[PDB]
Amino acid sequence: EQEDVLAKELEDVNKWGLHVFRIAELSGNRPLTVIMHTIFQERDLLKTFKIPVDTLITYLMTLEDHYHADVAYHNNIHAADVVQSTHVLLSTPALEAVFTDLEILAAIFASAIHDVDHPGVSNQFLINTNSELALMYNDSSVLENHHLAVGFKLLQEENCDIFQNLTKKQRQSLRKMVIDIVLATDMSKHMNLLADLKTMVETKKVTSSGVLLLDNYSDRIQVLQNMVHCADLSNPTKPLQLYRQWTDRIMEEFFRQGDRERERGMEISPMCDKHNASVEKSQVGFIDYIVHPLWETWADLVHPDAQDILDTLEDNREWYQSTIP
Amino acid sequence: EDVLAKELEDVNKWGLHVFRIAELSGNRPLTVIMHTIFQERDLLKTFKIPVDTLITYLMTLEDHYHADVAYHNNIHAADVVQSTHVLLSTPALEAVFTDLEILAAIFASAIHDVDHPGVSNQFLINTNSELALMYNDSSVLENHHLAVGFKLLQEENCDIFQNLTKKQRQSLRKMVIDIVLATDMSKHMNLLADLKTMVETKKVTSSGVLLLDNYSDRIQVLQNMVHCADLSNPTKPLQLYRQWTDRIMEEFFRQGDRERERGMEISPMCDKHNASVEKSQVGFIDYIVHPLWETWADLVHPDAQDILDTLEDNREWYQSTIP
Ligand SMILES: CCOc1cc2c(cc1OC)CCN(C=O)C2
Ligand SMILES: CCOc1cc2c(cc1OC)CCN(C=O)C2
Ligand SMILES: [Mg+2]
Ligand SMILES: [Mg+2]
Ligand SMILES: [Mg+2]
Ligand SMILES: [Mg+2]
Ligand SMILES: [Zn+2]
Numbered sequence: 001e002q003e004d005v006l007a008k009e010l011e012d013v014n015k016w017g018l019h020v021f022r023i024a025e026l027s028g029n030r031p032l033t034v035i036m037h038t039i040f041q042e043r044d045l046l047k048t049f050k051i052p053v054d055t056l057i058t059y060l061m062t063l064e065d066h067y068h069a070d071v072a073y074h075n076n077i078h079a080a081d082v083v084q085s086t087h088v089l090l091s092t093p094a095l096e097a098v099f100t101d102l103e104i105l106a107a108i109f110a111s112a113i114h115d116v117d118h119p120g121v122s123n124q125f126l127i128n129t130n131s132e133l134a135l136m137y138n139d140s141s142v143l144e145n146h147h148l149a150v151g152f153k154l155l156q157e158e159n160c161d162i163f164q165n166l167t168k169k170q171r172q173s174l175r176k177m178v179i180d181i182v183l184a185t186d187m188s189k190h191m192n193l194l195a196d197l198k199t200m201v202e203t204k205k206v207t208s209s210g211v212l213l214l215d216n217y218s219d220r221i222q223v224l225q226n227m228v229h230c231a232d233l234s235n236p237t238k239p240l241q242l243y244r245q246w247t248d249r250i251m252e253e254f255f256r257q258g259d260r261e262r263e264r265g266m267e268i269s270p271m272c273d274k275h276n277a278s279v280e281k282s283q284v285g286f287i288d289y290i291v292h293p294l295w296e297t298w299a300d301l302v303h304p305d306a307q308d309i310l311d312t313l314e315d316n317r318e319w320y321q322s323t324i325p
Numbered sequence: 326e327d328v329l330a331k332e333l334e335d336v337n338k339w340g341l342h343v344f345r346i347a348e349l350s351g352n353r354p355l356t357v358i359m360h361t362i363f364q365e366r367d368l369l370k371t372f373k374i375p376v377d378t379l380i381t382y383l384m385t386l387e388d389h390y391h392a393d394v395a396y397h398n399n400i401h402a403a404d405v406v407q408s409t410h411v412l413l414s415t416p417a418l419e420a421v422f423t424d425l426e427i428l429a430a431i432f433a434s435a436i437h438d439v440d441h442p443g444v445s446n447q448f449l450i451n452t453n454s455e456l457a458l459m460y461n462d463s464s465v466l467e468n469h470h471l472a473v474g475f476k477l478l479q480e481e482n483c484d485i486f487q488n489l490t491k492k493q494r495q496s497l498r499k500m501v502i503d504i505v506l507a508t509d510m511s512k513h514m515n516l517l518a519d520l521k522t523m524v525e526t527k528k529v530t531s532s533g534v535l536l537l538d539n540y541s542d543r544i545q546v547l548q549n550m551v552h553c554a555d556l557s558n559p560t561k562p563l564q565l566y567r568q569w570t571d572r573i574m575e576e577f578f579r580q581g582d583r584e585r586e587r588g589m590e591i592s593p594m595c596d597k598h599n600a601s602v603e604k605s606q607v608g609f610i611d612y613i614v615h616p617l618w619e620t621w622a623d624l625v626h627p628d629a630q631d632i633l634d635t636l637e638d639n640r641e642w643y644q645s646t647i648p
């Protein structure tokens with residue numbers, strides 16, 4: 001009956017604040033597989049793209065396995081969370097009938113693969129330690145290039161090509177969109193991505209039906225890039241009991257990186273020094289300089305669809321702030 | 326060796342006999358030309374590069390160019406190195422670039438096509454190659470050339486940068502990456518636009534020398550410089566240019582045999598049963614090489630007059646071969 005309790009929890013897949021850690025436990029540490037499968041069924045993607053269900057499950061389980069179970073934050077639970085958050089953002093009223101089925105597939109697939117094989121240290125750490133990854137990718141979006149390469153390579157494993165029935169033009173278009181989306185999750189691109197989102201909000205056009213008007217690739221991919229980026233940075237917008245767990249997990253990852261930097265004689269990265277860190281001040285700063293500027297701008301683009309999410313973010317900022325004095 | 330030594334005396338001159346140097350050096354033109362340039366520029370002393378580490382690395386690097394690729398081999402690498410070396414001595418660019426910037430442009434030239442398989446980025450992308458899978462279809466070859474060039478520094482006695490400071494090494498690496506990535510032909514138009522912008526807003530001394538204050542402008546010059554050197558074949562003496570044309574067309578035709586034996590859209594100039602070698606050269610000069618070299622000549626006015634003249638002479642000759 002554990003499967004019955006899991007099915008009950010998956011009924012919330014269209015809701016912000018899904019109990020994703022509960023789903024991870026109830027699914028036997030397969031949150032990415034069950035949430036992806038549920039979303040594909042919900043959006044009729046198996047029928048639309050003629051995806052064999054056995055192929056979908058085989059790919060998802062292989063992809064999920066290539067997330068590191070032994071990293072506290074950038075694991076399969078984070079991947080499932082970003083997938084489900086992207087799924088909700090795609091459903092927003094202001095975007096109804098705006099994106100094609102292929103664009104929706106691209107955004108959800110990009111979210112599922114976007115951190116695969118993440119080692120739990122930052123791009124800068126990989127660059128400064130002369131890692132094989134940084135050498136492979138010439139210090140440029142090192143992790144994000146790797147996540148894409150792994151995500152696409154796994155499609156070639158036995159019974160894993162979930163896109164086997166797409167047309168060549170469909171596969172070509174999907175591949176480009178997925179690459180554009182995942183490379184936009186590099187935090188070094190955040191300021192330019194947000195600057196561009198602000199420009200689009202300030203010049204936004206809406207159709208007679210009231211939804212966003214996006215009539216060229218540049219504008220369409222920019223919205224999908226910022227959507228998945230918002231989903232990636234969505235932990236402080238979630239109910240507090242979820243947000244606090246994500247904070248526990250990112251600080252564990254940061255502190256472990258700082259212990260490796262300290263042992264190597266390197267300067268310790270910001271927020272990574274467990275002897276000189278303020279978890280609470282770091283969260284307020286994170287929200288104030290990164291997460292709220294981004295989500296306030298997204299909320300403007302889809303106004304007023306995201307008002308409840310923005311209100312939760314502001315409440316959680318107030319809560320973490322209140323723990324400082 | 327004595328004849329090889331005499332040929333190498335032309336190292337500061339446009340139109341070095343690089344094919345002869347390739348013959349006389351035992352197919353080691355990249356090694357001997359790089360060594361000669363490092364001495365001519367006092368780079369070994371300036372950066373405390375042990376001569377035996379320089380030779381070991383250069384030989385390993387040269388070995389990773391493919392001998393069965395007609396154009397993108399070690400002779401082409403040697404030619405781009407030597408061409409960059411001459412462009413760096415342009416009078417309008419005197420006192421522009423630091424020694425580390427000079428080292429970066431020359432090292433970038435040497436590694437800029439290493440391990441080239443003789444097929445284009447589009448071929449690698451459309452064939453779902455391992456390279457394109459690794460590099461997400463984005464500057465596939467150029468990312469690979471860089472990764473190989475840098476990885477070879479870790480071979481036994483190959484770290485020619487071992488005596489650079491940590492900050493010098495980090496700065497060099499960034500500049501080399503920025504330069505080699507700019508050799509991707511899909512970036513040509515943006516790069517040329519930026520070169521034109523710099524021309525229209527150029528600042529000069531009274532003695533006709535360019536003033537490039539910020540790194541962004543300086544890296545753009547070095548990017549366009551190595552790009553110019555990469556595309557310099559039609560600006561060389563005709564006897565050399567014709568040999569380069571033979572070699573690129575062999576490589577293109579062999580790729581076209583593969584877009585046919587596999588069944589793809591045939592890349593331009595790659596169909597041996599429908600190609601006009603001479604028309605292609607004139608079109609290449611008119612749309613790519615001359616717009617680039619005319620803009621560069623304006624930047625360094627008038628120091629590139631002799632080079633732009635040869636280009637126009639060579640274009641006239643190829644046009645005269647068309648009936
Ligand atoms: C509760 C989540 O908290 C954070 C998450 C992340 C950062 C910072 C965070 O808070 C200080 C930095 C960027 N990032 C990379 O993976 C995620
Ligand atoms: C004599 C050499 O001529 C050529 C060289 C190249 C191209 C075209 C050329 O002539 C038609 C295309 C770009 N490229 C790539 O490696 C080099
Ligand atoms: Mg795993
Ligand atoms: Mg990431
Ligand atoms: Mg791993
Ligand atoms: Mg090249
Ligand atoms: Zn992520």
Ligand SMILES: [Zn+2]
Pocket residue numbers: 401405437438555
């Ligand atoms: Zn080249």
